[PDB]
Amino acid sequence: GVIEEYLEKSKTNKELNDKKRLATTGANFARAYTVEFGSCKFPENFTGCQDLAKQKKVPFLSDDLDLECEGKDKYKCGSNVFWKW
Amino acid sequence: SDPESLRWNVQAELVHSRWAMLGAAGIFIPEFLTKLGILNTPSWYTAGEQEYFTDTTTLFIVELVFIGWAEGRRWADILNPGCVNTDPIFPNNKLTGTDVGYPGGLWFDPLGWGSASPQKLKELRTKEIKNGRLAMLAVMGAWFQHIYTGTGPIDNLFAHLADPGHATIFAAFTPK
Amino acid sequence: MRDLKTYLSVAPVVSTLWFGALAGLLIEINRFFPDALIFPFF
Amino acid sequence: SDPEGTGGFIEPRWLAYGEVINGRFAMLGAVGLGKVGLIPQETALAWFQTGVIYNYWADNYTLFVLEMALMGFAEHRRFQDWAKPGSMGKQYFLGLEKGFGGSGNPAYPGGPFFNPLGFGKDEKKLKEVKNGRLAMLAILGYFIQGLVTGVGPYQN
Amino acid sequence: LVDRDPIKTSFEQWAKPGHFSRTIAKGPDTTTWIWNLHADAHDFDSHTSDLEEISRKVFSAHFGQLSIIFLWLSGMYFHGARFSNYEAWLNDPTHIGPSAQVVWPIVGQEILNGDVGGGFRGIQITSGFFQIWRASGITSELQLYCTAIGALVFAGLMLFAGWFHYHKAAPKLAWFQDVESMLNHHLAGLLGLGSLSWARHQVHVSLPINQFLNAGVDPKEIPLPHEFILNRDLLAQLYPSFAEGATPFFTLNWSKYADFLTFRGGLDPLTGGLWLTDIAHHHLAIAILFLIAGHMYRIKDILEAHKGPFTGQGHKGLYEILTTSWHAQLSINLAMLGSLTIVVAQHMYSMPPYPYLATDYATQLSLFTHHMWIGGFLIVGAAAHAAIFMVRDYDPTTRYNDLLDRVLRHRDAIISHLNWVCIFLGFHSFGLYIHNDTMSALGRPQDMFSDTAIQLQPVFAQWIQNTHALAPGTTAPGATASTSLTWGGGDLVAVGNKVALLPIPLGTADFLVHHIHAFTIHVTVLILLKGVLFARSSRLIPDKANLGFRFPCDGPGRGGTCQVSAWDHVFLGLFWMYNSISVVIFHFSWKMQSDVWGTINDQGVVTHITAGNFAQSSITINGWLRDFLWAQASQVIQSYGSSLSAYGLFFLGAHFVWAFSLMFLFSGRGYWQELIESIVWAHNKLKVAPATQPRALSIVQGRAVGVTHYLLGGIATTWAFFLARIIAVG
Ligand code: CLA
Ligand code: CLA
Ligand SMILES: CC1=C(/C=C/C(C)=C/C=C/C(C)=C/C=C/C=C(C)/C=C/C=C(C)/C=C/C2=C(C)CCCC2(C)C)C(C)(C)CCC1
Ligand SMILES: CC1=C(/C=C/C(C)=C/C=C\C(C)=C\C=C\C=C(C)/C=C/C=C(C)/C=C/C2=C(C)CCCC2(C)C)C(C)(C)CCC1
Numbered sequence A: 001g002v003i004e005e006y007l008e009k010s011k012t013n014k015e016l017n018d019k020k021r022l023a024t025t026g027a028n029f030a031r032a033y034t035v036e037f038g039s040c041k042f043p044e045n046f047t048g049c050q051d052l053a054k055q056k057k058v059p060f061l062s063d064d065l066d067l068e069c070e071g072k073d074k075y076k077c078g079s080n081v082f083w084k085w
Numbered sequence B: 001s002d003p004e005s006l007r008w009n010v011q012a013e014l015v016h017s018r019w020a021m022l023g024a025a026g027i028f029i030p031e032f033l034t035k036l037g038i039l040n041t042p043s044w045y046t047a048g049e050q051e052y053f054t055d056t057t058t059l060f061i062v063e064l065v066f067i068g069w070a071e072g073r074r075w076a077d078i079l080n081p082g083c084v085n086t087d088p089i090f091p092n093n094k095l096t097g098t099d100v101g102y103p104g105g106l107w108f109d110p111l112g113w114g115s116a117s118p119q120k121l122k123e124l125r126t127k128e129i130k131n132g133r134l135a136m137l138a139v140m141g142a143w144f145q146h147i148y149t150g151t152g153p154i155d156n157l158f159a160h161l162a163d164p165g166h167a168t169i170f171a172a173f174t175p176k
Numbered sequence C: 001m002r003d004l005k006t007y008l009s010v011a012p013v014v015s016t017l018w019f020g021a022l023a024g025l026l027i028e029i030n031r032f033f034p035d036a037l038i039f040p041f042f
Numbered sequence D: 001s002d003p004e005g006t007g008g009f010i011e012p013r014w015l016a017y018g019e020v021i022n023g024r025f026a027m028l029g030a031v032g033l034g035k036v037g038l039i040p041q042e043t044a045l046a047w048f049q050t051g052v053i054y055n056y057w058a059d060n061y062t063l064f065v066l067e068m069a070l071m072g073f074a075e076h077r078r079f080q081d082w083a084k085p086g087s088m089g090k091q092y093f094l095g096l097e098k099g100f101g102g103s104g105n106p107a108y109p110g111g112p113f114f115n116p117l118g119f120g121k122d123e124k125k126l127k128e129v130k131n132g133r134l135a136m137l138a139i140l141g142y143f144i145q146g147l148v149t150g151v152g153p154y155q156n
Numbered sequence E: 001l002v003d004r005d006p007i008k009t010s011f012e013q014w015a016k017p018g019h020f021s022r023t024i025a026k027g028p029d030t031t032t033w034i035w036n037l038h039a040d041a042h043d044f045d046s047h048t049s050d051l052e053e054i055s056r057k058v059f060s061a062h063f064g065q066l067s068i069i070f071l072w073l074s075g076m077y078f079h080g081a082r083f084s085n086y087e088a089w090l091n092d093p094t095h096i097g098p099s100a101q102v103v104w105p106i107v108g109q110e111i112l113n114g115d116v117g118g119g120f121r122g123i124q125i126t127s128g129f130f131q132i133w134r135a136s137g138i139t140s141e142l143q144l145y146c147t148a149i150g151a152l153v154f155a156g157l158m159l160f161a162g163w164f165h166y167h168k169a170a171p172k173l174a175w176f177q178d179v180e181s182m183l184n185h186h187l188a189g190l191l192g193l194g195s196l197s198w199a200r201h202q203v204h205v206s207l208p209i210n211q212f213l214n215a216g217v218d219p220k221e222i223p224l225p226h227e228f229i230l231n232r233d234l235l236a237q238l239y240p241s242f243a244e245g246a247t248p249f250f251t252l253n254w255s256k257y258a259d260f261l262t263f264r265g266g267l268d269p270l271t272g273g274l275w276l277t278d279i280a281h282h283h284l285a286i287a288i289l290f291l292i293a294g295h296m297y298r299i300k301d302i303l304e305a306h307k308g309p310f311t312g313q314g315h316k317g318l319y320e321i322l323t324t325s326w327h328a329q330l331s332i333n334l335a336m337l338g339s340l341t342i343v344v345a346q347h348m349y350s351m352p353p354y355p356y357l358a359t360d361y362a363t364q365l366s367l368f369t370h371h372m373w374i375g376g377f378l379i380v381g382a383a384a385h386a387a388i389f390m391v392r393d394y395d396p397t398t399r400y401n402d403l404l405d406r407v408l409r410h411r412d413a414i415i416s417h418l419n420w421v422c423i424f425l426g427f428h429s430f431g432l433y434i435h436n437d438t439m440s441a442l443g444r445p446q447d448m449f450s451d452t453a454i455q456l457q458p459v460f461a462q463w464i465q466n467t468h469a470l471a472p473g474t475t476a477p478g479a480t481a482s483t484s485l486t487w488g489g490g491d492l493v494a495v496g497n498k499v500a501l502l503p504i505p506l507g508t509a510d511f512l513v514h515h516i517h518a519f520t521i522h523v524t525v526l527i528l529l530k531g532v533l534f535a536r537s538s539r540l541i542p543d544k545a546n547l548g549f550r551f552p553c554d555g556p557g558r559g560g561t562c563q564v565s566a567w568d569h570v571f572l573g574l575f576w577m578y579n580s581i582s583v584v585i586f587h588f589s590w591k592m593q594s595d596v597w598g599t600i601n602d603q604g605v606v607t608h609i610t611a612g613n614f615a616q617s618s619i620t621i622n623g624w625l626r627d628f629l630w631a632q633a634s635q636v637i638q639s640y641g642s643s644l645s646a647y648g649l650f651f652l653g654a655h656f657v658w659a660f661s662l663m664f665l666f667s668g669r670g671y672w673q674e675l676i677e678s679i680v681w682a683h684n685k686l687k688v689a690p691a692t693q694p695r696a697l698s699i700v701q702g703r704a705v706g707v708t709h710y711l712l713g714g715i716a717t718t719w720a721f722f723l724a725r726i727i728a729v730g
């Protein structure tokens, strides 16, 4: 090579940039950075609204946790009275 | 039950190893002191100012002359006197063998006690780093491949490919 | 480690690291000059 | 000396009952988390439906293995080192009082077992402390694939 | 010996001059010994009197080979992946003309490498992976590059089990010389648990991934790579999740099904392999047997039992030995292994087992002649090693008085017959042809032997072939056509460029080749049979077993006293077999192309590579160079400047190497001595020779350098002659 000014006039820069909000990754899962979601206190289908659904419910999913095992239900086969249909 | 190496050029193999590793010494400190670039910054012009370049290869011949003489003359005498013919001491020639190389010629000889020695006192300094340097260099030279390969850009060549996620370098650090 | 008046041995066919190779470096002169049939000189 | 691994008729299972303790507390995390699992993109996809309601939020980084090799070192060191005869713990390069051992070469609750005096209470052979934890090991083994799926518990 | 015995040198011996038979290599110098020792590197007279190890060595040598195949064929499977041809061909098969292999361009090289392909320059291949291969469904080049390293895994390990024997301190007698299980295991669960295991990865995965390939796609438009478990929706097509059966059995109902299977008979149209679906069932129905079968048993028991009046007492304790001969339990094997390879060579060409073969002509006849020379190169062997038994292996006599001791009892007898057998043949088995010449060159066809002239009249048709397809009168159920398509009854219809497979009806001019085979198979065997039988003592020599199965020849007396021995019966027996196989090959392709290999054309008018020239014209044994050698071979001597060219360019060498053999075969021995000195003289004048006494070839070495060359000469000649008349038209 040969050199004219100054290796750089202004050095090295954006090649890793990230700095403030050096984000991507943490965040993204910005929905995640926080998880804050639903309710506080309870009844029922958080699951929003966004996010969505109640789908199967109390134990299911949620799982997730749901939470707290109720006096249920009690998943086990048997009930669900298997509602198809 | 195990190979027998012991191999016998050998003791030579270890002194070959010093050459490689002490030489390996020049690299690390200087490049890395590196100017901790650098305060800033580095320009060559100066000789090579515009003389149609300086070295290219011609630089390599001078490098070698200066050396040839040295690497050459050399082992030629690390040692070795007696220097002929028929039957074995084994070093492998062994000629120096009994005669040191000289009875009565000169002071070939260095120092007290019909001997070569600087003498007893020191392994000390230089068996542990200089050989520890046998080690050092190898990992740090093993470090050099690590430091360039992957060529960020310029050249994939022949791809079955299948990188990127991201580039490779040295500045230092590591990410992660 | 080898000085003056013959040295150490070698196996049955190190000729197979002498046919292969040395000789091998010669294709290496038969593509540098990919051709012959007379030859310029130096 | 070019290398030694003495084996007599049962070398194996001296380990084995050994591969078994380790293996066994790895039935373990089964005993007491449980899925890498696989080939890691999810990024979209579980076996074949896995999941649903990809694994996990999943931190983990394979750096292990870089870990498996690295701790490997400890394993094979404890074993040579005690070949032994011991300098080993240097203590304080100078001077004077070094009461402290902490006790033992360990095995068990007092480096020397210790606090000898005890219970009024709680009041009312050591391959068995092995045997039953394969009977905890090979158990999740089939419980990975523990399904009949198309049908389910015939029993029931 | 003593560099230094026992207890106290680890230190290896390299050096001080080294070893064999006790006036061991002299000290003082010679050449022959450098030829000794590659030869008869193992014989096992020497190393130890006592079998001791050797069985402890032959397990290790075996390991080496298994690795090696593995080193091989990783190589092959490589090559096959990353010089692909294959991805390209498979969308594309029946267009493609396939290579694994490419040169680099240095000097001439590269005439060789001529467009094969899905658009690349190649050397065209005739062993088919690409057909073993069709089976993998999943596809893509980098895997085969896993199957490849999976190969190099098995190797290093299935090659450190050979460290993990002999060299490692290692095993003792009982372990082989108590047999009692060994086939128990082998046939049960590998013979079984492979074919079994092969079933499981032969409908799981392969069947489906060519069930909907036999249409097209660009693969993976079809197949995900793992895709194939708990899952399966896909089995649903190709059939049910058994829906409600239980573990087979019956209280099962089909109103419409029966599990995958459903037997095929005949060939696929648009992939005429034969159904990819009898392929599971058949392997499944194998293994079971083996699965049940390898469950005998522990021995003399069965062998010691039945005796007869002719029949043999010997039959009993028909060999305490057998457990420890070895050389015998290899000789038996080779006859079978060997004779059980060239039974491949038929069931292959008259019942392809891989997708795209037949249409692929050249990539399954190469086969049928490679597999063909092993079911022969391994049989003459299967005699040699019996001769090696018959002379030596047991210390002492105690085999005694049996079945063998019986067979020998007659011996100028079993071989007394067999002889006339051959001259009856030969006269009815070759001069038969010579009639034709002498009388068609005299020229009066009225009286030849032509399929038309001497009367059978125009049917071949009924023997077996016609009962064989026609098959379901039967307790037979099954499958629209044949076991083999070729058999007489049935079908026009097989394949898409081209003909693959059709009746082949023979007549005469299949009649008499079929008979030259007899006479060729028979006089081969005469020489080996009489060779291995008269192994140890003969009416010409009694003192006959005394060094050797090898010795050159006993000595100028008794008249001749030369050939004798049985290295040499296994020297003149190769000499024949080279024909045995060399003319069976000559048979198949002249048929398979004169009839069968084909083309289809509108309205299916078949166009055989040669409109059946065979007809009236193989019967003449000149027609065999009019119609063969001078007809085809015109492609060998035209082949210059091309791509294959390496064949035409071999076909001169090796058609040279052969015509170098005779020099080694036809010559004296103290001759090249008498010469080797004139040489040795000129040598000494300049001071340039004596050390390592240069010596001529070891009577029988000279024969070793006959034969071996006569074969790798006379053989690759056709390996060239062939690949040069199926590549390019045909
Ligand atoms: C990414 C991965 C994750 C996964 C899957 C693993 C997996 C593994 N790690 Mg590990 N590890 C991780 C993250 C992970 N690690 C992290 C983030 C660290 C840093 C702290 C470690 C540090 C670590 C060490 C030091 C070791 C392992 C070891 C292991 C292996 C031990 C097997 C076992 O069951 O031991 C545990 C099961 C037992 C039955 C042993 C019981 C002993 C217990 C009672 C001691 C620890 C519990 C203790 C009372 C808790 C007090 C708190 C204390 C941690 C401060 C296993 C394969 C070990 C190994 O395999 O070395 C060869 C050991 O080396 N890991
Ligand atoms: C499963 C069996 C197999 C096994 C394990 C053996 C094992 C043995 N055989 Mg044997 N043999 C076999 C099959 C087998 N044979 C077959 C099929 C035949 C029929 C051809 C023979 C015919 C035979 C004879 C005649 C003899 C043996 C002998 C032996 C013993 C000597 C081995 C030796 O020194 O290597 C010998 C190998 C060499 C010296 C290597 C030279 C190979 C040359 C000819 C090259 C072949 C051509 C090829 C194209 C060249 C490579 C390409 C090149 C152009 C680049 C040994 C116990 C010998 C004995 O004395 O018994 C104790 C006796 O010589 N065998
Ligand atoms: C214990 C156990 C087990 C076992 C497993 C295993 C280990 C198996 C296997 C499997 C197997 C074990 C298989 C095998 C197979 C085999 C085969 C399949 C064979 C083959 C071969 C080949 C392919 C060859 C060929 C050829 C010929 C023809 C001759 C010569 C030439 C060649 C080589 C080409 C089980 C599962 C129960 C599970 C549980 C546990
Ligand atoms: C001058 C000179 C020379 C000469 C050369 C020449 C002249 C040659 C030749 C040659 C010829 C003239 C011939 C040869 C041939 C060879 C061969 C031929 C080899 C081999 C082989 C192979 C590899 C085979 C294989 C196979 C198989 C697999 C089996 C059977 C079939 C076949 C055969 C195919 C040289 C350079 C050398 C040296 C120097 C001097």
Ligand SMILES: CCCCCCCCCCCCO[C@H]1O[C@H](CO)[C@@H](O[C@H]2O[C@H](CO)[C@@H](O)[C@H](O)[C@H]2O)[C@H](O)[C@H]1O
Pocket: B112, B113
């Ligand atoms: C322990 C301290 C390290 C040693 C260095 C301190 C100085 C002590 C002398 C050793 C110095 C080496 O150099 C010196 O060694 C000898 C000590 O025997 C000196 O003195 C001696 O030399 C001969 C042995 O070599 C003797 O026979 C002589 O009577 C005496 O002159 C030498 O003139 C000098 O070559």
Ligand SMILES: CCCCCCCCCCCCO[C@H]1O[C@H](CO)[C@@H](O[C@H]2O[C@H](CO)[C@@H](O)[C@H](O)[C@H]2O)[C@H](O)[C@H]1O
Pocket: E491, E492, E493, E603, E604, E605, E606
């Ligand atoms: C080579 C010497 C001939 C001696 C054997 C002749 C006896 C049998 C007759 C011809 C044998 C060839 O069999 C062939 O018949 C027909 C040619 O006319 C072709 O007939 C085919 O083509 C047409 C397309 O729909 C239809 O007429 C048929 O349904 C179909 O089978 C077929 O491709 C093949 O089945």
Ligand SMILES: CC1=C(C/C=C(\C)CCC[C@H](C)CCC[C@@H](C)CCCC(C)C)C(=O)c2ccccc2C1=O
Pocket: C015, E663, E664, E665, E666, E667, E668, E669, E672, E695, E696, E697, E698, E699, E701, E702, E703
């Ligand atoms: C021609 C012929 C010879 C003469 C053949 C000889 C002498 C061949 C041996 C020649 C060797 C192979 C030459 C070896 C020399 C080179 C290997 C040494 C230099 C090494 C290189 C690098 C070239 C016999 O000895 C013979 C014996 C019995 C029956 C028939 C015949 C027979 O027909």
